[PDB]
Each structure stands twice: as C-alpha cells, then as structure tokens.
PDB file of C-alpha atoms in Angstrom:
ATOM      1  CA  UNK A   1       1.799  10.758 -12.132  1.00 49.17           C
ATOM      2  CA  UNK A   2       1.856  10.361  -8.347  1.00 43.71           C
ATOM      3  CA  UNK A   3      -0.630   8.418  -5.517  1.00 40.86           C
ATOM      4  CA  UNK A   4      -2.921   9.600  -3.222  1.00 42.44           C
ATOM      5  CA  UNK A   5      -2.388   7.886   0.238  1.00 44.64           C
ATOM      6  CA  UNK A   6      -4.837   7.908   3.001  1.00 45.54           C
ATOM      7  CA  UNK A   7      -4.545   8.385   5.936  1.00 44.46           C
ATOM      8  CA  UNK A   8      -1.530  10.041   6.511  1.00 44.71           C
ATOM      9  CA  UNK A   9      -1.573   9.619  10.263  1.00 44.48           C
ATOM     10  CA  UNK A  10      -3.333   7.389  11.949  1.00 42.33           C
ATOM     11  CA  UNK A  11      -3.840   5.703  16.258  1.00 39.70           C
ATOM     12  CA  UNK A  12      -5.540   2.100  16.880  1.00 41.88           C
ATOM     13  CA  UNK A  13      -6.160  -0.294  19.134  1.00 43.33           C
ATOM     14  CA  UNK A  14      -5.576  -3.948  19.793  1.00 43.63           C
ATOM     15  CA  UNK A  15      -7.929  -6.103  17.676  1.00 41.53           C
ATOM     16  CA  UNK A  16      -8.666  -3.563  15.525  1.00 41.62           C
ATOM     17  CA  UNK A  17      -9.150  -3.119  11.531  1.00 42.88           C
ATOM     18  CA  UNK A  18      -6.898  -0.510   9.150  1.00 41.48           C
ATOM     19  CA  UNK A  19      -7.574   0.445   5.706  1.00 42.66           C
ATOM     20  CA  UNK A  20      -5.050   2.607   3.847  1.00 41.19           C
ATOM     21  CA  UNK A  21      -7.251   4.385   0.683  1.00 43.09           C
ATOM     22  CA  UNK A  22      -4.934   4.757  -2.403  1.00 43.41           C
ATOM     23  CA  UNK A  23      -5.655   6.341  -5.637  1.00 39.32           C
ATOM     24  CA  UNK A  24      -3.054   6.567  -8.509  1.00 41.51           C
ATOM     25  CA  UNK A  25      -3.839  10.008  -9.738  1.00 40.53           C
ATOM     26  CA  UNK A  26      -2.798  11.764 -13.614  1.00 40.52           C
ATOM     27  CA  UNK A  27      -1.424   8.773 -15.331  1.00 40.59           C
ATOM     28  CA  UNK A  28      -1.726   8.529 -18.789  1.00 43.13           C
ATOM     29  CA  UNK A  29      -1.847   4.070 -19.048  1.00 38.77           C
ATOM     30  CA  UNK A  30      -3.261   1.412 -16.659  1.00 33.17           C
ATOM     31  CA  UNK A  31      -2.809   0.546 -13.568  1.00 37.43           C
ATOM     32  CA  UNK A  32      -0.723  -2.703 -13.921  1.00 41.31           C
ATOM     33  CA  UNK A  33       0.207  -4.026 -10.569  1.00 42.90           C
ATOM     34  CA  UNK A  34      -0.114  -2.820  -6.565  1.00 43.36           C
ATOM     35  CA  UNK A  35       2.444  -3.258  -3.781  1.00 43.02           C
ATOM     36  CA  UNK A  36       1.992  -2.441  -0.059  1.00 43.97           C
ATOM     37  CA  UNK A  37       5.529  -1.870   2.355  1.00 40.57           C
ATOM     38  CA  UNK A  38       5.888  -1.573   5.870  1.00 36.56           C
ATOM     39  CA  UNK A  39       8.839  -0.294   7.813  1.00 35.30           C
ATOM     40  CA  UNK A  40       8.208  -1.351  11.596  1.00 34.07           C
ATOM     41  CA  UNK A  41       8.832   0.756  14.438  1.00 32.79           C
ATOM     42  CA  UNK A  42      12.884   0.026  15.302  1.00 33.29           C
ATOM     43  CA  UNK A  43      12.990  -1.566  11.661  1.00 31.76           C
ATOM     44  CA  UNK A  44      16.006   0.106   9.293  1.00 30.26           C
ATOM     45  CA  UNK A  45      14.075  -1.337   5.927  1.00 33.67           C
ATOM     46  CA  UNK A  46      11.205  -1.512   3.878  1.00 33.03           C
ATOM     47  CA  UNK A  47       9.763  -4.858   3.762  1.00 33.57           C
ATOM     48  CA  UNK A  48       6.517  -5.925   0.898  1.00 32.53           C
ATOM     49  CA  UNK A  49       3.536  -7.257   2.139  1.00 27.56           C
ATOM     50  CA  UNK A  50       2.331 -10.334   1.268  1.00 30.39           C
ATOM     51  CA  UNK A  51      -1.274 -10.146   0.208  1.00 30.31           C
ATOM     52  CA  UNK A  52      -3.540 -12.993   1.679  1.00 32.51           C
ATOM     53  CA  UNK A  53      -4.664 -13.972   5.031  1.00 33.76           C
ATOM     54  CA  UNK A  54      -4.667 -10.813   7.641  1.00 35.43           C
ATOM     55  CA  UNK A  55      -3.993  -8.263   5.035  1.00 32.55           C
ATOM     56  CA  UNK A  56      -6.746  -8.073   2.133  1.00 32.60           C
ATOM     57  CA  UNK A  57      -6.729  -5.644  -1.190  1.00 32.78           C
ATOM     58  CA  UNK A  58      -9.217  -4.480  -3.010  1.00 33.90           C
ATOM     59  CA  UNK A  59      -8.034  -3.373  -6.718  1.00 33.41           C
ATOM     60  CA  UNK A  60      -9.974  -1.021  -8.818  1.00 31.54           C
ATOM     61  CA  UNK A  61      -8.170  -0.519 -11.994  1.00 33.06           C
ATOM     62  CA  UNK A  62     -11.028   0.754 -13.741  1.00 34.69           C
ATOM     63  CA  UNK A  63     -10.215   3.887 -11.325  1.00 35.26           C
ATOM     64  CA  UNK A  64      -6.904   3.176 -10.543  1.00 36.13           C
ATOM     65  CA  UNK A  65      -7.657   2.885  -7.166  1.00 35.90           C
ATOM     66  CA  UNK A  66      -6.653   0.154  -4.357  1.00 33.44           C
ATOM     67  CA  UNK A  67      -6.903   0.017  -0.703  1.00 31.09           C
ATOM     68  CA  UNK A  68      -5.296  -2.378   1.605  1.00 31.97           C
ATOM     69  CA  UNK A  69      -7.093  -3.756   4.501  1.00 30.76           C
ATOM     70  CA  UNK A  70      -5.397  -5.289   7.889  1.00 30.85           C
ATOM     71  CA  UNK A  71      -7.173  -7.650  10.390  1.00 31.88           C
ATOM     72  CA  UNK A  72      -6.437  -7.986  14.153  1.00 33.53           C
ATOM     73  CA  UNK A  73      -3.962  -5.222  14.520  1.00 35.32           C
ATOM     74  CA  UNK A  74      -1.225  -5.250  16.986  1.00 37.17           C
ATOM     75  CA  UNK A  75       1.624  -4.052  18.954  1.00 38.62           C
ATOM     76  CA  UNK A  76       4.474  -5.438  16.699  1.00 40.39           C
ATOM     77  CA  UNK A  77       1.877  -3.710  13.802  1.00 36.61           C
ATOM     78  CA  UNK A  78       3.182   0.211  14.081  1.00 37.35           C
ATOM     79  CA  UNK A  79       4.996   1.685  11.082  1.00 37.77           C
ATOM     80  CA  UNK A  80       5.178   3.254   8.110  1.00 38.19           C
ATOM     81  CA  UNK A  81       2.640   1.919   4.914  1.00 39.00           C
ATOM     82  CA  UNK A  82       3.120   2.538   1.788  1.00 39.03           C
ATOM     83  CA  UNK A  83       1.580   1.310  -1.473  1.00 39.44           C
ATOM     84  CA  UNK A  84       3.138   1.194  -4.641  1.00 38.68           C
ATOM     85  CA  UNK A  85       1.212   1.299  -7.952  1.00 39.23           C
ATOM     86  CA  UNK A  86       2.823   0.778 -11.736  1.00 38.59           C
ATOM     87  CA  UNK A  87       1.616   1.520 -14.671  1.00 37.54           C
ATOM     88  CA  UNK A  88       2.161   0.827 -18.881  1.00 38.53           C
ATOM     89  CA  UNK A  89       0.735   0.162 -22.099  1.00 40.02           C
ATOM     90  CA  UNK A  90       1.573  -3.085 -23.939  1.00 42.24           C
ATOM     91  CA  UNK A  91       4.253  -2.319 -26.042  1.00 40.13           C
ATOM     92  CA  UNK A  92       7.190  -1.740 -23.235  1.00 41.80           C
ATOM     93  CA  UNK A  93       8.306  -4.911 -22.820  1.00 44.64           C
ATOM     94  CA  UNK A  94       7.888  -5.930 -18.659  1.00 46.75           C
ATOM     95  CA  UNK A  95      11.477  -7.575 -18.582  1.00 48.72           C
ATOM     96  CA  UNK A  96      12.403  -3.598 -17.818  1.00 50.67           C
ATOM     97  CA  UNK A  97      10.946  -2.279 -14.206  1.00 50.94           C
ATOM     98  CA  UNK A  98       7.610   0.137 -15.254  1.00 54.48           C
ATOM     99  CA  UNK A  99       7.182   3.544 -13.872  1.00 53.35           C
ATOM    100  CA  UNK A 100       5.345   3.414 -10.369  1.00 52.42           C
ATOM    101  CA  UNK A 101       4.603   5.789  -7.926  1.00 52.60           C
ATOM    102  CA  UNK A 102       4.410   5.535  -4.212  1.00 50.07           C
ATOM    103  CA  UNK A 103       2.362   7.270  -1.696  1.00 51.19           C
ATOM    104  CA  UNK A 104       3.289   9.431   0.599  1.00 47.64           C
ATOM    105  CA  UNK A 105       2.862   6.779   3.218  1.00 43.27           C
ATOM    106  CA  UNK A 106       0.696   6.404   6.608  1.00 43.05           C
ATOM    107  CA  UNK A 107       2.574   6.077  10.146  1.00 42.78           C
ATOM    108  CA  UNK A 108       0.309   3.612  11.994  1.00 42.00           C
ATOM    109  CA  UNK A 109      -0.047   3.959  15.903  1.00 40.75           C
ATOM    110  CA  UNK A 110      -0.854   0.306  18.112  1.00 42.81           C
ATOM    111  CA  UNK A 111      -1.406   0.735  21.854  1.00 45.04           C
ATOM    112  CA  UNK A 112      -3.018  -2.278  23.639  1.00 43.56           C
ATOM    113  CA  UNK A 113      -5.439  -2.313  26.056  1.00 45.62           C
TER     114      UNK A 113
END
C-alpha cells in the first residue's frame, strides 16, 4: 500500500487554517489507526502530534481517508507534516507494530503579517 498526501507544498499566513488531505490508497485490510508528525523548521526530529485542541482530525475509515486540520497558524508552525496510517485484520496480534504507510509529507510555509 502507500498514502496519498496533500498538499505537497504549501505558504500561509498568521491566523490562518491548514488541512493536510490523506488517503491510504491499495491496501488490502482496514484502516486501524492515524498519526500526524511534524519536523519544525531548525528541528533535527520528528515529533507526533497530539490530536485535540488546535489540531482536529477527521477519520474516514470507511474510505480510508483522514485529514488533519490546524487552527491559528504561526511562525514557530513551519515544517514538514506527515501522517501515518496502519492497517490489519484481526488475527495479527497488535502486541507486534502493524504495517503503516506514510505520506510523502507537506512542507508548510508561516510568514506573519
């Protein structure tokens, strides 16, 4: 399998909204759990977003699609996004990591202004 990330480049401004489309594309079982990762600008390392407050996602397993949304963007905001999205049946026991896939990321732009 493998995700469809979008966009894949992206400029915003102060106060502004993102949403990062993803879509988990030729995967034979569900769509089991989403992550989202940021690397900030000047930042060495991947770091998972925490879900709730400013950041928002809306799952559709059904399609195995997800999106993340981001409120009041920001200087300190620029980076690298990318969602993760794993996949099984019921038989493989979860005690063992499950195939994922990660997009192909989008590098996020803040100015002020």
């Amino acid at each position: 399998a493998w995700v469809d990330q979008t966009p894949r480049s992206v400029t915003k401004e102060t106060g502004e909204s993102l949403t990062i489309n993803c879509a988990l594309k030729n995967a034979a079982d569900d769509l089991e759990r989403t992550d989202w990762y940021r690397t900030t600008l000047g930042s060495t390392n991947e770091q998972k977003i925490s879900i709730g407050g400013r950041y928002v996602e809306t799952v559709n397993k059904g399609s195995k699609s997800f999106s993340l949304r981001i409120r009041d963007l920001r200087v300190e905001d620029s980076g690298t996004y990318k969602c993760g999205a794993y996949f099984s049946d019921a038989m493989s026991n979860y005690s063992y990591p499950i195939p994922g896939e990660k997009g192909a990321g989008t590098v996020l732009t803040v100015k002020a202004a």
